[PDB]
Amino acid sequence: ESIFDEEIKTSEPVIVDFWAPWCGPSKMLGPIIDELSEDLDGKAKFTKVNVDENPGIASKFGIASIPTVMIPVETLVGFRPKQSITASIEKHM
Amino acid sequence: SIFDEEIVDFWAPWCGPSKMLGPIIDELSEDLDGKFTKVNVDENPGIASKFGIASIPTVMIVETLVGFRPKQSITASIEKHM
Amino acid sequence: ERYDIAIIGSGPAGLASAINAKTRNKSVIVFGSSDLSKKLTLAPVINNYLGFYGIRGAELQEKFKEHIDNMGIQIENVKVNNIYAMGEYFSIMTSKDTYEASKVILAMGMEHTKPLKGEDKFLVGYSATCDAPLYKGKIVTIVGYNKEAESEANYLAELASKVYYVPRYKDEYQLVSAVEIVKDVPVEIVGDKKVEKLKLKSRELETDGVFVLKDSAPPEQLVPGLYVEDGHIKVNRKMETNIDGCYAAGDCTGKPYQYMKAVGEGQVAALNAVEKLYT
Amino acid sequence: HMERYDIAIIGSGPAGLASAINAKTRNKSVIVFGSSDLSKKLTLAPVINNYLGFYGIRGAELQEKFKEHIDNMGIQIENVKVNNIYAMGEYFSIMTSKDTYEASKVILAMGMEHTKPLKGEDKFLGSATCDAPLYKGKIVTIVGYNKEAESEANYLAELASKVYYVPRYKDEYQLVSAVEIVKDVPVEIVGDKKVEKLKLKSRELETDGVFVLKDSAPPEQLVPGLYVEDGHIKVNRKMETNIDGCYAAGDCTGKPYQYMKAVGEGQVAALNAVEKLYTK
Numbered sequence: 210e211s212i213f214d215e216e217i218k219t220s221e222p223v224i225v226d227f228w229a230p231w232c233g234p235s236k237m238l239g240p241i242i243d244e245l246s247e248d249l250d251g252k253a254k255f256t257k258v259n260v261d262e263n264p265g266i267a268s269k270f271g272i273a274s275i276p277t278v279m280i281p282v283e284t285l286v287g288f289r290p291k292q293s294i295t296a297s298i299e300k301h302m
Numbered sequence: 303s304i305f306d307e308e309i310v311d312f313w314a315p316w317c318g319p320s321k322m323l324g325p326i327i328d329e330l331s332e333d334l335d336g337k338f339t340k341v342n343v344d345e346n347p348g349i350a351s352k353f354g355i356a357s358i359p360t361v362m363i364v365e366t367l368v369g370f371r372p373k374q375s376i377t378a379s380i381e382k383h384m
Numbered sequence: 385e386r387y388d389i390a391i392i393g394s395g396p397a398g399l400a401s402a403i404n405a406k407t408r409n410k411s412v413i414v415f416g417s418s419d420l421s422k423k424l425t426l427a428p429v430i431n432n433y434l435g436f437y438g439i440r441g442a443e444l445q446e447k448f449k450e451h452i453d454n455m456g457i458q459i460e461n462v463k464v465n466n467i468y469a470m471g472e473y474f475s476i477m478t479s480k481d482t483y484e485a486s487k488v489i490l491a492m493g494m495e496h497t498k499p500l501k502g503e504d505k506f507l508v509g510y511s512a513t514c515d516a517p518l519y520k521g522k523i524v525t526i527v528g529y530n531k532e533a534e535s536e537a538n539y540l541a542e543l544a545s546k547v548y549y550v551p552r553y554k555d556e557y558q559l560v561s562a563v564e565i566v567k568d569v570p571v572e573i574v575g576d577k578k579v580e581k582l583k584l585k586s587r588e589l590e591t592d593g594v595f596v597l598k599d600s601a602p603p604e605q606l607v608p609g610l611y612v613e614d615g616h617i618k619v620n621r622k623m624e625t626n627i628d629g630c631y632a633a634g635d636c637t638g639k640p641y642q643y644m645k646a647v648g649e650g651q652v653a654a655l656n657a658v659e660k661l662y663t
Numbered sequence: 664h665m666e667r668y669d670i671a672i673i674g675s676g677p678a679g680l681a682s683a684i685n686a687k688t689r690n691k692s693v694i695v696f697g698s699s700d701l702s703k704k705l706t707l708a709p710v711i712n713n714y715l716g717f718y719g720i721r722g723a724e725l726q727e728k729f730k731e732h733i734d735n736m737g738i739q740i741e742n743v744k745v746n747n748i749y750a751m752g753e754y755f756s757i758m759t760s761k762d763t764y765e766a767s768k769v770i771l772a773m774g775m776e777h778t779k780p781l782k783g784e785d786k787f788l789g790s791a792t793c794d795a796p797l798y799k800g801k802i803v804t805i806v807g808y809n810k811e812a813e814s815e816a817n818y819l820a821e822l823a824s825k826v827y828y829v830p831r832y833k834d835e836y837q838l839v840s841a842v843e844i845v846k847d848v849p850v851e852i853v854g855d856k857k858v859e860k861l862k863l864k865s866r867e868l869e870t871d872g873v874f875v876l877k878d879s880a881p882p883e884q885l886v887p888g889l890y891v892e893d894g895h896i897k898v899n900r901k902m903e904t905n906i907d908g909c910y911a912a913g914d915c916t917g918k919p920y921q922y923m924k925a926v927g928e929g930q931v932a933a934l935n936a937v938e939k940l941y942t943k
């Protein structure tokens with residue numbers, strides 16, 4: 210947890226994937242997020258948060274859904290395909 | 303004489319397209335007053351030959367448009383040339 | 385086992401797409417009702433379908449049915465809950481089973497509108513089962529369009545401090561005692577920063593979260609990431625949506641609602657979908 | 664303002680027919696130009712399995728179904744070929760050799776046209792009847808695809824210093840002695856500032872201007888001012904051309920050539936055409 214907070218302060222946008230084992234969409238995003246991290250190695254860095262394991266992290270940022278992608282700059286709720294996420298990063302940087 | 307000083311629709315009575323163009327030209331002048339002359343190739347071949355009119359229905363501005371053209375295209379071209 | 389093409393809907397578009405995809409030796413699956421389309425069967429007389437002057441809807445429906453049966457095309461009688469565009473393929477989600485296919489074609493017809501949902505979607509829900517733990521000890525309201533929604537409402541009662549269930553259908557409700565039934569017409573969702581209250585015609589409910597569990601999902605929700613403008617899926621000349629390898633045809637695209645456009649739109653989608661498999 | 668139809672449909676194929684029945688559905692006067700046989704391709708095709716509702720049906724049999732439909736709706740095909748369509752603004756003037764017609768809206772339904780090699784680059788430098796006086800006492804070459812060209816060549820020969828006729832059809836040619844017949848296939852036209860020579864497979868001809876007389880005109884020539892890209896008419900979702908009141912449907916727009924696309928496109932064009940008439 211501490212390591213994540215240190216990374217949040219550093220940088221190079223940082224993307225948080227909020228997911229739960231039970232939620233089907235969240236499972237879909239992790240493979241998409243893994244593919245995004247492999248594709249992007251410089252523009253941004255990705256971290257995965259299990260909402261089940263880190264309830265404190267979730268409440269603090271006001272996560273509204275089990276599968277949510279967060280980068281303060283912008284917040285995407287619900288499953289999204291790679292192309293949409295990538296484009297949102299591109300402009301937002 | 304006035305036209306030469308200022309310096310055109312080339313039309314002929316046998317060409318159907320040139321006939322259609324005339325009335326189209328007339329509408330354009332009425333429609334846009336501020337931002338046209340008709341040349342009869344039959345009566346002024348010298349005027350036509352001098353400018354190199356190679357097709358009877360030709361519109362001459364800087365820019366030459368040969369063949370019939372609709373109101374929208376001609377207006378757009380004129381606006382672009384300005 | 386992934387099919388080459390998956391067709392969402394069994395209407396004129398879906399069938400028109402199906403026969404063209406099957407013609408070119410590509411594996412095809414069609415999701416829909418055993419009856420092709422309620423509109424086809426219901427139509428009294430159709431004069432604008434070329435070649436079938438004065439044909440009854442049910443009579444035209446018969447001609448279409450013969451076409452696919454004679455071609456060995458079977459309708460998968462299931463409803464598609466969700467379709468997740470993975471990138472190279474599409475995962476199709478259904479309560480009874482899960483399928484994946486390389487290309488998708490949408491033929492959903494028309495769906496019910498949403499009241500002021502999209503204003504604060506982040507602080508609103510659609511999954512319910514996904515978001516229940518977040519609302520522990522909080523007020524939850526559910527707008528139910530089917531029985532599955534009732535069951536989700538019973539589930540929420542276990543976690544939430546208060547659960548409201550608003551039925552849009554008239555039926556006996558199988559609900560636990562904790563759930564409160566609210567028989568009124570939803571109007572608007574309002575909140576300052578996040579959802580705070582749900583306004584009905586004759587009642588107001590203060591609630592932290594609102595869940596709208598729908599029987600006929602909109603295309604945007606059914607396919608996460610699909611670009612929809614003016615209530616109809618966006619398509620280019622080839623019937624391509626914003627998602628690569630995802631097509632749409634028929635009433636869903638948004639043009640005049642007619643059979644002949646629907647079949648044409650479906651055909652163009654299928655032929656182009658086949659083209660993309662190669663090259 | 665005489666006999667102005669609400670909608671004029673150019674072509675009697677599936678797209679043209681699909682548009683016609685829809686325009687007739689909404690009580691709008693319609694005229695359809697095309698062949699009495701509607702479409703050669705329909706009659707010629709062996710079987711259709713991808714037209715939904717007809718399985719393994721021979722082309723000629725499908726053509727019969729289409730004839731019954733229009734016949735039941737009181738739609739008659741005017742069996743003439745459309746030579747030109749001039750967009751005047753509020754209406755369209757439709758020229759044929761036999762008569763002249765005017766319509767508020769137009770729908771184009773012609774599947775294919777003859778290709779031109781090196782024509783469009785020097786079109787300006789080289790409508791023979793309309794531009795013949797300009798070429799008095801000059802060399803002019805004619806490429807003829809129909810009998811009208813022979814008559815036009817004989818006319819041109821009287822005014823020009825030299826007339827060449829390149830026939831693309833094998834038939835007896837009724838031509839004056841002054842006109843010279845050249846049995847070869849054109850290859851390329853060449854010129855720097857103006858047309859200078861027309862190149863054939865085994866021959867080269869020095870000429871001032873070249874006139875190309877075709878039996879099946881391309882859409883660009885048929886409708887002066889129409890925007891065409893990639894050999895097909897450009898159309899938006901509603902089947903609208905660059906011309907404000909001209910639609911197009913079927914093989915002419917482009918894409919896959921198929922019956923169901925053609926009829927769908929024809930329907931959308933017609934319905935859109937009706938809608939614009941309704942607003943007024």
Ligand SMILES: Cc1cc2nc3c(=O)[nH]c(=O)nc-3n(C[C@H](O)[C@H](O)[C@H](O)COP(=O)(O)OP(=O)(O)OC[C@H]3O[C@@H](n4cnc5c(N)ncnc54)[C@H](O)[C@@H]3O)c2cc1C
Pocket residue numbers: 392393394395396397398415416417419420421422423424426427428429430431432433462463464465491492493494601606633634635636641642643644646
């Ligand atoms: C009474 C009536 C008369 C009509 N008459 C005419 C006419 O005379 N001429 C004319 O041109 N048009 C007519 N129409 C309209 C025309 O029929 C429709 O536009 C056309 O039928 C639409 O076909 P479609 O498949 O696009 O939509 P539909 O035909 O409605 O296709 C919908 C199909 O998709 C299935 N489906 C939907 N959602 C899902 C999902 N989420 N998952 C799985 N499956 C799903 C549905 O169950 C259904 O099978 C008429 C309509 C009606 C109601």
Ligand SMILES: Cc1cc2nc3c(=O)[nH]c(=O)nc-3n(C[C@H](O)[C@H](O)[C@H](O)COP(=O)(O)OP(=O)(O)OC[C@H]3O[C@@H](n4cnc5c(N)ncnc54)[C@H](O)[C@@H]3O)c2cc1C
Pocket residue numbers: 673674675676677678679696697698700701702703704705707708709710711712713714743744745746772773774775880885912913914915919920921922923925
């Ligand atoms: C043997 C053969 C088999 C085929 N089989 C199939 C099949 O099984 N399934 C399928 O989907 N497609 C098939 N096609 C292709 C399909 O038929 C075409 O895409 C379709 O015919 C296009 O219809 P259309 O109305 O847009 O144009 P067309 O059918 O080509 O229109 C031709 C009509 O337009 C008239 N016309 C053209 N120009 C003018 C003009 N300037 N002035 C006046 N009239 C004009 C002509 O008189 C003619 O009657 C086949 C084609 C062939 C040759």
